[PDB]
């Protein structure tokens, strides 16, 4: 199974169109968090109450 | 000799004829069960009683 993963991998890389993809900008993570939002959290509560 | 010719010519044709299809995922099965929803299931027998 491995080695026809291994020839499979070949064939897909030699059949690859795009003749270089490259990394604009490395992965970098935002220090201010995305969830939980707290302030419309707290002011659902609010109408919800 | 040109019939000789047209055959080599032919065979290797024949060879070199293979791709097309690159199969990028295997077959794999969710363990998840898709049918039946239990949830929607319930809400629906509740709503309809």
């Known amino acids: 199974l ?3 993963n291994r020839q499979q ?3 897909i890389a ?3 169109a ?5 990394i604009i900008d ?3 993570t935002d ?3 995305v969830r939980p939002k707290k302030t ?3 002011v ?3 109408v919800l109450g």
Not at 18 to 22: A, D, L, T
């Open 2 to 4: 491995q080695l026809l």
């Open 9 to 11: 991998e070949l064939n």
């Open 14 to 16: 030699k059949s690859s």
């Open 18 to 22: 795009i003749g270089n993809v490259r």
């Open 26 to 28: 490395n992965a970098v």
């Open 31 to 33: 220090p201010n968090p």
């Open 40 to 42: 419309i959290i707290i």
């Open 44 to 46: 659902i509560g609010v």
